[PDB]
Design a protein around this ligand. Structure first.
Ligand SMILES: *[C@@H]1O[C@H](CO)[C@@H](O[C@@H]2O[C@H](CO)[C@@H](O)[C@H](O)[C@H]2NC(C)=O)[C@H](O[C@@H]2O[C@H](CO)[C@@H](O)[C@H](O)[C@H]2NC(C)=O)[C@H]1NC(C)=O
Ligand SMILES: *[C@@H]1O[C@H](CO)[C@@H](O)[C@H](O)[C@H]1NC(C)=O
Lengths: 183, 188, 15
């Protein structure tokens, strides 16, 4: 509906009773500029460019999330405790860069259509749980008010190792696995 | 599973022609139900579902709340855009360009995949050539793929049949590149 | 210059 050269979210604000937990982030043209670590009261910028030239007061996020908590309790009362519906996430795995054996790379696991925003994303290497070299985005907003989240695995392509992205979510009957390997 | 009650607030700024045309839409969401919003093109809060009137009427009756929200079009949207102009909107990451076939035997249909990866911003032009002829059919492209780390990639595939001694080239133009990247694949 | 943000309106309801 809204045509624009650029779109920013200068507050994606989230609070949920499970935990409870929250998230505060800014987005520009669909990518996450920062989130605020609400426990540590720290703004965590997502690019070195941003870390050196930008600043955001973490108390702004803390204050806003406190308002959401207040608002949430009002709307629970007004809705007779209407709970969130669990949606079925969609999972895709692809590489960051063209694959050549022996050349360090990154695998990307996109977990889309997440709701509610509670998920476990982990990696398997030859069936083994991966403990290092994993990072992930925050929850990224969607115009239908679900979320997506992206996890990253650093890896060394080889002829003897294969990968799965493993996703746990209340909308799934069992853990969902998405497979990837160098062809 | 455990029940969960979710609340979202999304403050969104829409920009066109720099900061000349700006629209602010703030959205109040219970679970996934948007129940109230402020749209600067409307100028007051509106209820969008039956959950909303108590919120919208309250904020509209609080003139300093209303007035502060109207001012955010300037004090937040445009203000922060000036900061984007110094950083985000100057970010330039050059694409890496690779060609590979999808096994390759001469008179047998194949797909040539031009991988254009790790670039920013999103604007890009990718063209296939067969010898000196630009390929305007048989091209199948993925959507723009968002990697989540402030880069994109796109795969542009060419349906073709290897014949000797055809030469194929993928030509890539991008705001990060002073001259186009040309990568070539030679049949046999 | 510091980034600013959009303030969440607060509902008025009995606590
Ligand atoms: C708010 O939601 C709860 C849960 O749905 C309702 O209580 C449930 O009512 C259903 C059907 O009447 C009954 O089968 C369940 O046992 C009951 N679950 C509970 C109490 O945990 C509330 O509905 C109103 O509750 C009273 C108390 O039981 C009922 O006498 C009344 O019929 C019921 N009305 C409904 C469900 O429409 C509900 N509150 C309101 C105001 O609707
Ligand atoms: C994620 O894993 C944790 C720890 O193993 C578990 O307690 C939690 O219930 C899981 N969350 C899901 C499946 O959404």
């Amino acid at each position: 509906d809204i045509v624009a050269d650029h779109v920013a979210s200068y507050g994606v604000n989230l609070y949920q009773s499970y935990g409870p937990s929250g998230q505060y982030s800014h987005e520009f043209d669909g990518d996450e500029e920062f989130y605020v670590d609400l426990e540590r009261k720290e703004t965590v910028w997502q690019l070195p460019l941003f870390r050196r030239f930008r600043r955001f007061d973490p108390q702004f996020a803390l204050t806003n999330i406190a308002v959401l908590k207040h608002n949430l309790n009002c709307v629970i009362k007004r809705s007779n405790s209407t709970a969130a519906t669990n949606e079925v996430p969609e999972v895709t795995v692809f590489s960051k860069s063209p694959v050549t054996l022996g050349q360090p790379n990154t695998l990307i696991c996109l977990v889309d259509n997440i709701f509610p925003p509670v998920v476990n994303i982990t990696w398997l290497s030859n069936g083994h749980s991966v403990t290092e070299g994993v990072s992930e985005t925050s929850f990224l907003s969607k115009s239908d008010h679900s979320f997506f989240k992206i996890s990253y695995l650093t890896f060394l392509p080889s002829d003897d190792e294969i990968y799965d992205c493993k996703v746990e979510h209340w909308g799934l009957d069992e853990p969902l696995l998405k497979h990837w390997e160098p062809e | 599973s455990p029940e969960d009650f979710v609340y979202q607030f999304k403050g969104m700024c829409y920009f066109t022609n720099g900061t000349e045309r700006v629209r602010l839409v703030t959205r109040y969401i219970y679970n996934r139900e948007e129940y109230a919003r402020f749209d600067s093109d409307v100028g007051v809060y509106r209820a969008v579902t039956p959950l909303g009137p108590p919120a919208a009427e309250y904020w509209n009756s609080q003139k300093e709340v209303l007035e502060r929200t109207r001012a955010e079009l300037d004090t937040v949207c445009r203000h922060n855009y000036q900061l984007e102009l110094r950083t985000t909107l100057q970010r330039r990451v050059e694409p890496t360009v690779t060609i590979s076939p999808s096994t390759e035997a001469l008179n047998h249909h194949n797909l040539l995949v031009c991988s254009v990866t790790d670039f920013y911003p999103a604007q890009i032009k990718v063209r296939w050539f067969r010898n000196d002829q630009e390929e305007t059919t048989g091209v199948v492209s993925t959507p723009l793929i968002r990697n989540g780390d402030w880069t994109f990639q796109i795969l542009v595939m060419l349906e073709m049949t290897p014949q000797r001694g055809d030469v194929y080239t993928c030509h890539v133009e991008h705001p990060s590149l002073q001259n186009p990247i040309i990568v070539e694949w030679r049949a046999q | 210059v510091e980034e600013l943000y959009l303030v969440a309106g607060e509902e008025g309801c009995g606590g």
